[model samples]
Target: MVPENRRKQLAIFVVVTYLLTFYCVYSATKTSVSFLQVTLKLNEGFNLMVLSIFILLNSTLLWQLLTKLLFGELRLIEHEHIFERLPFTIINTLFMSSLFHERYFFTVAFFGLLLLYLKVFHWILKDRLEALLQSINDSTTMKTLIFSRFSFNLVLLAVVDYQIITRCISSIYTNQKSDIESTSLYLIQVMEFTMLLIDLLNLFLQTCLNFWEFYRSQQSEGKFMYEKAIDVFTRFLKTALHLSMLIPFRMPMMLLKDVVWDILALYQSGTSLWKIWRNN
Candidate 1:
């Protein structure tokens, strides 16, 4: 019911499992685990995160492979659409391939990408199934569910944001050879938090728009242009948020790479900000 040749697929996945596992151990040994300075501490911290990600990725595949091999293809979902399955296959491959590289700059980027892709994937494929909502069977229930989602995301973002700040504080509290990079990282953390707030706003707007669309459909319909824009932009916001939050190392690097060109555009008028704070 899955790929054409189960036997061959199984063997290929076994190699995949092997490679992912091998990469996990291989990377861990090579990753400088101990930290005496702030930079090394950050490297250690980020490496721990990257390693955790690979471990989860590896274990899930191992579990699935084992189950399918032993139990003969346990159904995870009821009818996987080609549109969904096809992109998922490609994206998962891209992710695993990205993981193979020693550089985590792109590894975090790709994983961040997978989560956003998954979010959009849910929007496109999962929304049609009302039962998936579990209790969206009525307007009251729908409203309650939306409110709960809003609250859950709020708390999720809050805790994660706090953790970022706390980790930054503790990292610096422990050690820093130079104030320059460490100082900038704190500002970057601030930038990252602002990004998350914007994401929360974007998601809030989108959720409202989605609810509005649903509610209007129940009444009768027209007009989704603004709503369409919200959906796309929210997705962009959310994915960018994931990258900065999950891997704090990316922020300073991105800072060095672009020097916050897009940041000025996104937050407020670049020229005015430049004008107001002129001549640095």
Candidate 2:
């Protein structure tokens, strides 16, 4: 069972984060401004500050979710080390770069690069993750959480796939303009498809690993050894969501929604690094 204090903290974090996310979505819709327009209208420094805050908040939310899902509790201390939090910063940087860049190929190339980086990250932290696996108890709650996360990922994957296929078909059949805007939208759809495909693979790996570990533990007295699978999938999901900010085919409000989430993620990465530096 989660400690009362930790449970309360988690409750507060969830409520506050979701509420703020909703507010951002609502504001983006209620105000008749596109993401680009909003950015352009604001003072440059102020806009940067706002983006930074959103990134920090989003990153904090991601970290909290990871801890709760993996350990069934909140434990930021484990990630206080700079080395432990470095991957998040790297991934966020790649995500934001992909979003800001106009080239679809650039985004695809960055996704590949991020995948390579994550693979290396997993290998480097293997021993630590192995220890975490050993420490995890075979709790029903943990299993339920894993299953639910897996299910939700499937839904998200389906939604992305549907969007990609429909948009591609529409682009091919209805309009084949050689203009910059049309070509840009086509590229964005392609990039979204590729990123979503990678995310789907990550989710599959996590689900398979979860099932394998559960079965092996049941069959023997050995400890769970696949906890890193969950960690990797979580990391990939975070990366994918951040990358979604680059999808320019969405409506103005939808684009703003993604921007809000990306801002939160950026803010979290900044503050996390700051905390690590201060402690050191």
Candidate 3:
């Protein structure tokens, strides 16, 4: 069990970090507005929406990290599950994509600010999880399995986020046609989809752990409120995880029979409307 003092410290840290991140995003958005408008040739309303999306994504990541850190060890709650981590993955990808497209001096600074928050959360969570592992005896296969599953999740997260960031940056800043080559983009997308699959598998392992823990407790002490709560949470997580993983891959395929068709759709949708209008 986490010590009270340590938990209090973590709570304070999470709150302060979130507030600081919000302030940074707000200032950065204000400073970068004019630059985005001029480069994208966006109207005021659309410019505002673009900036708002970035801010919203950043805030969601911050909120999720806070919840994960504070309640990481708690039995899987309906709102907090292994797959809940995917929003951060999605937002970080979106942010990287925007960074590549945006041409502004302050944009780099704003991006750096968000990156700092990510690093801090990563460092703190690493320490906390390590401490939790230490509390368990390594002699048991259970410990080994849990550690392996957790490590696999971490590796997938890093690989997917890094690939997204790299491709986004290269596509925008590099002149080499191969930097944003069709083959490369397809490969990255495949890796991302695979990561989603692995993430779902990790969720299954975690859910099993939670269910086992809840069951053992119930066996010792007859059915209780906490067990009921755990059951409800696990059911919700199972359903949501199934949907989130299946939908993204299936939706685009359903929209068009060919993979290339889906890619074209993505390109059209993501292209700056200003650029599209100019061509028209």
Candidate 4:
């Protein structure tokens, strides 16, 4: 087994890498595209929509903070694991000249609040999740909690991604006269699709793990009601995660065709709701 200190170091490294990767990806596209300002001029409604998108995107940190406040005790390591990685995302976005020009002080203030929330929430949730995990010897209960948590994450990610993609589409649609390069648009598409793919993979893997645990727990006679609940929850979670993966894939050629089209298609079947929405 890896030493605890080594694990912590590894976690920090992963967070840093994620942040750097996010920064580089955003920077590349920002350099190539000056569409934001053009898009802002479309109409008051369009501008407000775009603004909401930015707010929602930036509020991801806040969302995480809220979740940690409520559920951090159930997954201490995972909670810290997420927060450690988030600051890098914030810093990277802030570094972007185009993106950082708006109310940065406010953003920084919110980030500070997020940090304070994390610190307090982390300590509180750590003990609770540990106690709950330890006190409940039944496999079923453990499985349920794990599945519920996984499902919650899936829903949260789905909503965030939907807002992001909608914002991107809005940006493109609102500024018909802007001279955005094909390469920049394609990069945005690639990045968003890649993110959705990553989330889908994560959800699927968590579902599988939860299902496996459920099955193992079910085989034993000592399984408690809580344990059975875990299995059922995992079942629902697995379905929800799979659906989340499908929704984005169902969109138009612009949104669906990314760097890994064939690979994504191989993993699922049928049309996504986005396809229907587009047709309407």
lDDT of 2: 0.52
Q: lDDT at 173 for candidate 3?
A: 57
- Which residue runs does candidate 2 get wrong by more than 4 Å? 1-135, 139-146, 157-169, 216-280
Better of 2 and 4 by lDDT: 2
Better of 3 and 4 by lDDT: 3
- The top-ranked prediction according to lDDT is 2
Instruction: Write down the worst ten-residue block by lDDT for model 3.
Output: 74-83
Which candidate's TM-score is highest?
A: 1
TM-score of each: 0.37, 0.33, 0.30, 0.35
Candidate 4: the clashing residue pairs are: 73-125, 73-129, 140-226, 140-227, 141-226, 141-227, 143-230, 144-230
lDDT by residue for model 3 over 146-202, one digit each (tens)? 756665556555574566566655654555554443333333344344434343444
Q: What stretches of model 4 exceed 4 Å from their correct place?
A: 1-65, 68-87, 95-146, 170-174, 179-197, 216-280
What are the clashing pairs of model 3?
none
- Sorting all predicted structures by lDDT, with the top scorer first, yields 2, 1, 3, 4
Give the poorly placed runs of model 3, Cα more than 4 Å off: 1-62, 65-110, 142-144, 176-280
What is the descending TM-score order?
1, 4, 2, 3
**lDDT tens readout by residue for model 1, 237-256:** 64465555435555434544
lDDT of 1 at 113: 42
TM-score preference between candidates 1 and 3, better one:
1
